[PDB]
Design a protein around this nucleic acid. Structure first.
Lengths: 208, 97, 41, 105, 280, 76, 94, 79, 93, 97, 97, 86
DNA sequence: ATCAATATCCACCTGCAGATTCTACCAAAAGTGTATTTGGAAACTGCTCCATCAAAAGGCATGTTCAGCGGAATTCCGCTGAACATGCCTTTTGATGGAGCAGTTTCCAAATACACTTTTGGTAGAATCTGCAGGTGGATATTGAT
DNA sequence: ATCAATATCCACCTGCAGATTCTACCAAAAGTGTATTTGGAAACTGCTCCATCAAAAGGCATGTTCAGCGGAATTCCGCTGAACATGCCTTTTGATGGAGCAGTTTCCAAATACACTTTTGGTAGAATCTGCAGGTGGATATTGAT
C-alpha cells in the first residue's frame, strides 16, 4: 500500500454540464503492446557500447507492438502452424499497408492541414507521443534488432501465445442511409474555425 | 333532555350492531311468516326448530349482503341515502331475477 | 507579409458559409436553429 | 402398531378411502395413494384454524367460538375465495365502514 | 476449485482478498501474484509494467455517460453493443466476488450501470447493477454487487434505491427475483421497509394498494411481503381489494438519521428505442 | 439479406452520436472566457478541437465501407 | 343409532398445533361442514376429470392437478407441497 | 290475512344498519318486504319438494341446508 | 366420444314444422344443450338418491329432480309429458 | 318392437340408459323407469325448436342458422332461468338501447 | 355534405353492431395476445384454432356483459357516459371472486 | 446453440380500440375515454384466469397442445360454459 | 379553548351452562395375508395437423383538429327522515298434550348378469342443388342550417 | 317551414357450399330371453319432539321539531365524437418442415374381494371444574354547549 504515486501522475478537470463520453478500448487505450520483464532491461544488454544515436528507456515500446499485428489480422487462418510467417525482409509489403493499433484508418485524413510543428495530436493517446518516435522510418533504421527475438518468442508456445487470452428488397428504406453523408466534411471545417488560429498565434513575440 | 347532533348517534348504532353478532330479527313473526308462506304449496306441514333457525340466519345473511351492495351503489351515486331505484338496480347487477 | 495582413482577412468569412449548410435540414420548422454551431465564437 | 397415519398425517385414512369409494362416479380408486388427499385437507383446515387462533388470543377468550372464525376467515385474503359461497352461521360481519360516511359533518 | 484463486490481489488503490473463483485466465496461477488496476481493467500478475505502463493510456474516466452527480458519488451507463470488451471484463472483475452468476453466454445483451466515487484524479467505481433491455421476466434489475473495499459508509444502499427510479422514468413497474440473497438479505429488505413508510406520511387516507405501484413502482406481489415484514397493515378490506393502515409511528422519528442516502430526481432519460432481436 | 439486415445498424453506433455537436461547444464556450481577457494553457484548444470528427472518421471507416458494400448484390 | 363425524380428528389437529384452545360444538359443526363440503368438492371435480380423461382408476396425480385447480394459488402451492411430502413419506413403508 | 308486515321497520332498520347505511328513505320498506318474500319462497319451494320426496311430511334442518347448498347460498353449521 | 345426438334432433325438428333447416354448428349447439342438461339432471338425481340413504334410482326421484331444477310452468309441462310417456310404456309390456 | 319407437318418445331410451349407468354412482339404475326422464329431453328440445318457429314466421329465411338461435333462450324469459349458465356461440345480443 | 348533430351516427352504429352477429376483436393479434400471456405460465405450449376461437368468443361475451352492466351503472349515476369509477363499481358488486 | 424459440413477449396488451366496437355491441353511448387501460387490464385478468386452469387440464392430460374440448370444459367449470363449440 | 355529560375500558364478583376429559363398552370396522383379474404404464410407428414464413391488396388503425355539450361545481331551497318520549302491543318465557320418525321382519319384484342374434346408426363415397351471401340499381325514410 | 345529399329496403341474378339422402359396409350395441340375487313396500310399535296454551316486561308505534339533505337549475370548460389524410400491418392463400397425437399392441404392478382378528374411535353418562355471561362499579376517553 505504497505503490500509488509512481503510477498516479496526471491531471483532472471537472465538468461543465455532464461528463459525456464515447469510445472503444482500442481507440482510447491507443497502443496494444506487451512485454516481459526479462526483455525490459536485458534485451538491451550491451547497448551501452554503441549508443551513438537514440537509446532511451521509453522509445522501444511502440515498435514492439507493430510486428505481431501481421499474424492475428493479415493471416487469421494461421491458428497453430509453426511454419508461420515470412522473414523480416520478406514481410516488407506488410509495412506499406498494415493495421498496427489501427494506424492507417487513424492516419488517412491527417495531411490536409500540416500544422507548423507537426500534425495530429489526440487526447486519446498519452502526453508524450511525439519523441515517442515515428515508426515510418525505423523499420529500415533499427527494425532487424527486434525480429529475431520475436522470431524465437512465439514459437515456444506456437499457435496460442504466452500472454493470457479468452478461453471458450431495395425500396424506400435505405435512402436516409446514404443521406447520412451530408456530414461529409462539416465537422472539421468548423473545427477549422480555430484550427487555423494556431499556426501563427503561437509566435507573436518574434519581433523581439 | 339533550338532543345530540343529527346522524352522529346513527354511527354508534351501526358500530353497536356491527360488533355484536346475535340474530337480530325476532323469531316468531318470522316463524308465522314462513309457516303461512309454506301453506301455499301443500297444506298441513310442520317444521323443526333448527330448520326455521336455518331459514332466519339464511335470510339475514342474504339481506345483509343486499344492504351492503346497495349502500356501496348509493355512495357511488354521490348520495348518502338509499332509495328504491338503487336497491333494485343493485339487485339487477348482482344478477338474479 | 506573413506577419502583418494575412492573420484575419483570410479568416473573416470562413465562419459564415455555415449559413448555407445549416439549411440542410429542409430538403419541424426550426428556423432559428442555434443548437450546435451558431454560437461557436 | 401404526394404523396408517404413518405419513405424518392425523386424519382418518379409512373413512376417506371409503368415502372416495362412496362418491365414485368411476369404479376404482388407489387405496394406498389416496393418502394424497386427506393430507391435503390437513393443510387448509389447519391453515384455516392456525389463523383462527392467530387473533383469537387478541380477543382474550381461550375457548374459541363461532364469531372470530369469520372475523378473518373472510378477512384472510385467500381463504375468502375458498369459502366465498358460504355464509357461516351467526359469526357476524366484519367491522368495515366506508370513509365517505365518516367525514365530520 | 470454487475458492478464491491466489493469495493477494490489489484493486487499484487497495488490496482485496477476493471471495470466490472467477473464470480468470488460467495460466497466471503458477506465479504467485495477480494484480489489477482501475480503469483499463486489463489483467496482469506482476507490477513489472503498470508502475508506468499505464502510460499505455491517459484514460481517467470510463466511457459511461455520468448520468447523476452529487456531493459524494456519481454513476454512469454502459451498453454491451457500443463496447465489446471492457464492458465484459467488469463482470470478470467480480465473478470472483459474486457467488453464483458467471458467464458462459456472452454478456452483450445487458445494459450495465455502475456506481462511482469521485476522486482527485479519476473517478473510481464502487458498484454495478445490470438492467436487461426489455422485459426478460419482468425483473427490472439483475446482479448487484459493491466493491469490497468500500462498504459500511452506506453507499452500497443508495444504488438499489436508484434502481427503482428508472422504472417510472419509463413508466412500468418492476422488482427483482429470488435468485439468492443471504449476503444482502436484509439490505433490499431495509429499503423495501422504508420505501413505504417514508411516503405513507402524506396520503390523506382511504388509499388503495395498487396506486403505490403507480407511485413508487414497487410491485403488487411484494407490497404485502413488506406489509408483513413489519407490523399489521390490514384488517379492513374484507369484501374488496387490500387496504393499508398506519400506526403509532416509531419509524419516521427514526427517519432523521439514515435518511440522506437519496438521489436528486432531476437527470436524463434512459430509453433504448431500438429492438435488436437477439438469437445467438 | 445484404440490404435487409445490413440496413440500420450503422445508426445505433451513431445513436450515441448526436452528442458530437453537443459535446463540443460549451467548453469552447468556456475557454473563450480564457481569451476575452501569456500563452500558458492556450495551446490545448486545438487538441480537443481536432478530436471533433476523429471518431466520426472512425465512423467514416464504417460509413464508407457500408457504402463500399453496395456491390455485394448484383442489383445495387 | 349410528352416525359418524369428524369431531375428534379436528380436535386433535388443532390442539396439536395450539394446545391452549377449546371448541364449542357449534364451531365444531362449522368446521365439520367446511371439511365435508370441500371434500365433496375435490371429489366431484377430480372424478369428473378422471372420467373424461379415458380413465377408471382414480389415481393420485389427477387429484394433485385437481387440488391445484380449485384451491386458490398460494394455498394450492403449499397444499401440493405437503401432499408431495406425504406420499413421499408413505412410500417408505418402514 | 297478511303477516309479511310482521317484520317491522325497526327490525329491518337494524338489518340495514348492520350493513352500514346511514339514511333510510321511507319507502324502501315495502320492497324490502318484497325481496324477502321472493327469496324466502324461492328457498321454501325446493325445501318443501325435498321433504315431499322423502315421505316425511315435515321438513328438517338437513333438507333445508341441502336446499341452500343447491342454490348457490350454502349455509354452514346446521348439517 | 364417437357418438352424437344428431339424427335425433333432425327427426324432432322434422316431427315439428318441416320447412326449416338445421344448420352446421346448430347441431353442436343443441347437442351441447342436451348433453349439459342431461349431465345436470344426472348429478343432482344421483345426489338426491344418495343423500336419502337409498340405494337405487327410480322414476320418482328423477321426477322430483326435474321438478327441482326448472322454472315452474316448464316444469309442469315437462312432468306432464313425462308421466304421459311413462304410462304409455307401462300400458303394453 | 324397438323400445324407443314403440314408446312414442323417439329419442333413444337405450342410449339414455347406460349414460346414467356410466355416470351415476348408486350402482344400480332402474331399467324401465329411466324412460320417464328422456321424455324431458324431448320436451325441452321441442321447447327450443318450437319457439324457433319465430324465424319461419318473421325472419323470412328458412334454414335456421345460429344467430337465429338468439331469439328464444335468455330473451324469452321462461327459458332464461335454465340457460344463464350457457353463453351461445356467435349469436349476439337481443336489441335494446 | 354538411354534418348533422354530434351523436346520431354513433347511435346508428350501436344499433348496427348490436343487431349484427360477427366477431369483433381482430383474430391474429388476439391469438398473439393469448400466446404470449400463455407461455409465461409454462414454456412452449401449442394451441389449435378452434380452441382460440372459443377463447375469443368467450372473452367477447364476458366483456360485453361487463359493458352492459356498467352501462346500467352509468345510467343509474344520472350520467350518459361511463368512467373508471362505475366500471370498477360494476365489477365490484358483480363479485369477481 | 439455438436453445430458445422466438417470443414477442412485449407490449401486446394494446389490442386495438375495438373496445370501441364491442362497447357499442352493448348498449353504451359516448364512452368518455381513460377507461381503456383498466379494461385492457381486466381483459388480461379474465384471460389469464381461464387459460391457466385450461393449461393445467392440458398438462394433466400429458399433452402439450390445447384443444377445444378441454378449454370448453375449463370454462365450464370456471363458472360459465361456452356452448356448442366443442 | 373549557368544562358537563356519556360511555366505554378495566377489574372484580358470582352462577351456570357446558366442554373436556374418561372410560367402559362395543358394534363396527381398518387392517392383514392371499391370489387375482385386469386396467395402466409405456413403447411401437403411421400421419393429420400446427407453425413459421412470405407477397401483395386493402380495409382499417393512428394522429391530428375542430366544434359543443355533457360533467361538474356551486348555488338556493323546500322536505322528509332522525331523533326522543310516551303509550301500548305482542313478545319471551315455563308448562301439559299427541301424531309422525325412525327402528324392525318379511314378500316379491326388478335389475343384475350372460348371450344370441340384428336392426340401426355412425362414416364416408359422393350426388345436387338450392338456400344462402352478395352485388346492383329502383323506391323511401333521414333529420339538420337556413 | 324545408331541400339536402345519405343511408335503407327489395326484386333480381349468381357462385358456392354444405345439407341430405342414398349405398352399404359394418361394427356394434340393444331387444329379448333366463336364474337368482338383493333391494324396496307395507305393516308395525313406541318414543318422542311439535303443537298449543297462560302471566311478567322490553321493544314497536305513533307521534312532533328541525336540519341535514336531495333536487333543480345554471353557467363554465375541457375533453370527446366526427372527418379526413394518411401508414401499416393485417389478411388471405400457398408451402414446406416436422412432430406430437393417436390407434394399437404389449407385458405387468396393483386395487378388489375375501375370512379373520385384533384395536379403536363413537357415545353416553358424568364429574366437575371453569370460561364466560351478566351485573356492578370506578376511571380515563369522547362529544356537545358556550
Amino acid at each position: 500500500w505504497n505503490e500509488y504515486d509512481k503510477f498516479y501522475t496526471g491531471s483532472f478537470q471537472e465538468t461543465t454540464s455532464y461528463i459525456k463520453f464515447s469510445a472503444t478500448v482500442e481507440d482510447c487505450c491507443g497502443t496494444n503492446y506487451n512485454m516481459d520483464e526479462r526483455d525490459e532491461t536485458f534485451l538491451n544488454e550491451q547497448v551501452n557500447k554503441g549508443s551513438s544515436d537514440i537509446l532511451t528507456e521509453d522509445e522501444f515500446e511502440i515498435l514492439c507492438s507493430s510486428f505481431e499485428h501481421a499474424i492475428h489480422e493479415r493471416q487469421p487462418f494461421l491458428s497453430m502452424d509453426p511454419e508461420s510467417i515470412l522473414s523480416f525482409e520478406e514481410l516488407k509489403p506488410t509495412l506499406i499497408k498494415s493495421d498496427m493499433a489501427d494506424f492507417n484508418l487513424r492516419n488517412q485524413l491527417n495531411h490536409e492541414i500540416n500544422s507548423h510543428k507537426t500534425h495530429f495530436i489526440t487526447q486519446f493517446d498519452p502526453v508524450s507521443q511525439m519523441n515517442t518516435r515515428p515508426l515510418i522510418q525505423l523499420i529500415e533504421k533499427f527494425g532487424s534488432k527486434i525480429y529475431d527475438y520475436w522470431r524465437e518468442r512465439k514459437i515456444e508456445v506456437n499457435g496460442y501465445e504466452i500472454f493470457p487470452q479468452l478461453k471458450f428488397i431495395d425500396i424506400l428504406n435505405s435512402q436516409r442511409l446514404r443521406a447520412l453523408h451530408q456530414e461529409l466534411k462539416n465537422a472539421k471545417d468548423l473545427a477549422l474555425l480555430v484550427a487555423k488560429r494556431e499556426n501563427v498565434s503561437l509566435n507573436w513575440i518574434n519581433d523581439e | 333532555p339533550h338532543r345530540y347532533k343529527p346522524g352522529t348517534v346513527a354511527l354508534r348504532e351501526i358500530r353497536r350492531f356491527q360488533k355484536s353478532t346475535e340474530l337480530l330479527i325476532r323469531k316468531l313473526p318470522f316463524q308465522r311468516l314462513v309457516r303461512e308462506i309454506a301453506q301455499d304449496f301443500k297444506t298441513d306441514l310442520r317444521f323443526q326448530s333448527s330448520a326455521i333457525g336455518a331459514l332466519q340466519e339464511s335470510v339475514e345473511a342474504y339481506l345483509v349482503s343486499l344492504f351492503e351492495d346497495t349502500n356501496l351503489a348509493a355512495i357511488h351515486a354521490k348520495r348518502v341515502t338509499i332509495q328504491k331505484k338503487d336497491i333494485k338496480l343493485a339487485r339487477r347487477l348482482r344478477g338474479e331475477r | 507579409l506573413q506577419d502583418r495582413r494575412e492573420q484575419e482577412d483570410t479568416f473573416d468569412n470562413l465562419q459564415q458559409e455555415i449559413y448555407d449548410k445549416e439549411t440542410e435540414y429542409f430538403s419541424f420548422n426550426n428556423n432559428d436553429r442555434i443548437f450546435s454551431l451558431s454560437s461557436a465564437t | 402398531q401404526s394404523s396408517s397415519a404413518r405419513a405424518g398425517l392425523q386424519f382418518p385414512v379409512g373413512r376417506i378411502k371409503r368415502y372416495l369409494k362412496r362418491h365414485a362416479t368411476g369404479r376404482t380408486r388407489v387405496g394406498s395413494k389416496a393418502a394424497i388427499y386427506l393430507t391435503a385437507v390437513l393443510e387448509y383446515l389447519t391453515a384455516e384454524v392456525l389463523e383462527l387462533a392467530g387473533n383469537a388470543a387478541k380477543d382474550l377468550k381461550v375457548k374459541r367460538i363461532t364469531p372470530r372464525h369469520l372475523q378473518l376467515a373472510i378477512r384472510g385474503d385467500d381463504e375468502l375465495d375458498s369459502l366465498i359461497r358460504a355464509t357461516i352461521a351467526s359469526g357476524g360481519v366484519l367491522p368495515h365502514i366506508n370513509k365517505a360516511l365518516l367525514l365530520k359533518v | 476449485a470454487r475458492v478464491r484463486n491466489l493469495n493477494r490481489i490489489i484493486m487499484g488503490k487497495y488490496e482485496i482478498e477476493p471471495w470466490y473463483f472467477s473464470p480468470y485466465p488460467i495460466e497466471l496461477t503458477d506465479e504467485d501474484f495477480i494484480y489489477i488496476d482501475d480503469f483499463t481493467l486489463q489483467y496482469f500478475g506482476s507490477k513489472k509494467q503498470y508502475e508506468r505502463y499505464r502510460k499505455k493510456c491517459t484514460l481517467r474516466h470510463p466511457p459511461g455517460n455520468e448520468i447523476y452527480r452529487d456531493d459524494y458519488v456519481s454513476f454512469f451507463e454502459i451498453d454491451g453493443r457500443k463496447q465489446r470488451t471492457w464492458c465484459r471484463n467488469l463482470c470478470l472483475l467480480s465473478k470472483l466476488f459474486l457467488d453464483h452468476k458467471t458467464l458462459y453466454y456472452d454478456v452483450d445483451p445487458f445494459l450495465f450501470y455502475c456506481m462511482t466515487r469521485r476522486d482527485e484524479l479519476g473517478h473510481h467505481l464502487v458498484g454495478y447493477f445490470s438492467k436487461e433491455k426489455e422485459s426478460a421476466d419482468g425483473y427490472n434489475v439483475a446482479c448487484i454487487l459493491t466493491l469490497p473495499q468500500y462498504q459500511r459508509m452506506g453507499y452500497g444502499k443508495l444504488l438499489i434505491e436508484f434502481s427503482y427510479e428508472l422504472s417510472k422514468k419509463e413508466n412500468k413497474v418492476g422488482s427483482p427475483e429470488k435468485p439468492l440473497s443471504d449476503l444482502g438479505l436484509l439490505s433490499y429488505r431495509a429499503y423495501w421497509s422504508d420505501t413505504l413508510i417514508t411516503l405513507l406520511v402524506e396520503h390523506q387516507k382511504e388509499i388503495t394498494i395498487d396506486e403505490i405501484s403507480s407511485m413508487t413502482s414497487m410491485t403488487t406481489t411484494d407490497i404485502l411481503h413488506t406489509a408483513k415484514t413489519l407490523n399489521i397493515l390490514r384488517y379492513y378490506k374484507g369484501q374488496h381489494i387490500i387496504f393499508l393502515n398506519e400506526d403509532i409511528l416509531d419509524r419516521y422519528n427514526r427517519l432523521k438519521a439514515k435518511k440522506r442516502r437519496t438521489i436528486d430526481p432531476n437527470r436524463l432519460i434512459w430509453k433504448p428505442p431500438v429492438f435488436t432481436a437477439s438469437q445467438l | 439479406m445484404d440490404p435487409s439486415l445490413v440496413l440500420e445498424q450503422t445508426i445505433q453506433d451513431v445513436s450515441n452520436l448526436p452528442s458530437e455537436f453537443r459535446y463540443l461547444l460549451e467548453e469552447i464556450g468556456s475557454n473563450d472566457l480564457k481569451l476575452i481577457e501569456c500563452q500558458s494553457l492556450q495551446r490545448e484548444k486545438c487538441v480537443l478541437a481536432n478530436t471533433a470528427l476523429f471518431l466520426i472518421a472512425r465512423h467514416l471507416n464504417k460509413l464508407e465501407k457500408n457504402i463500399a458494400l453496395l456491390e455485394e448484390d448484383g442489383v445495387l | 343409532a349410528r352416525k359418524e363425524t369428524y369431531s375428534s380428528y379436528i380436535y386433535k389437529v388443532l390442539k396439536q398445533t395450539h394446545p391452549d384452545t377449546g371448541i364449542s360444538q357449534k364451531s365444531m359443526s362449522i368446521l365439520n361442514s367446511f371439511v365435508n363440503d370441500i371434500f365433496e368438492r375435490i371429489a366431484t371435480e377430480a372424478s369428473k376429470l378422471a372420467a373424461y380423461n379415458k380413465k377408471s382408476t382414480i389415481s393420485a396425480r389427477e387429484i394433485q392437478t385437481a387440488v391445484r385447480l380449485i384451491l386458490p394459488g398460494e394455498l394450492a402451492k403449499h397444499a401440493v407441497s405437503e401432499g408431495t411430502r406425504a406420499v413421499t413419506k408413505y412410500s417408505s413403508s418402514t | 290475512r297478511d303477516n309479511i308486515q310482521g317484520i317491522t321497520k325497526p327490525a329491518i332498520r337494524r338489518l340495514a344498519r348492520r350493513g352500514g347505511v346511514k339514511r333510510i328513505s321511507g319507502l324502501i320498506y315495502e320492497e324490502v318486504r318484497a325481496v324477502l318474500k321472493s327469496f324466502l319462497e324461492s328457498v321454501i319451494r325446493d325445501s318443501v319438494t325435498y321433504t315431499e320426496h322423502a315421505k316425511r311430511k315435515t321438513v328438517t334442518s338437513l333438507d333445508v341446508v341441502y336446499a341452500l347448498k343447491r342454490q348457490g347460498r350454502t349455509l354452514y353449521g346446521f348439517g
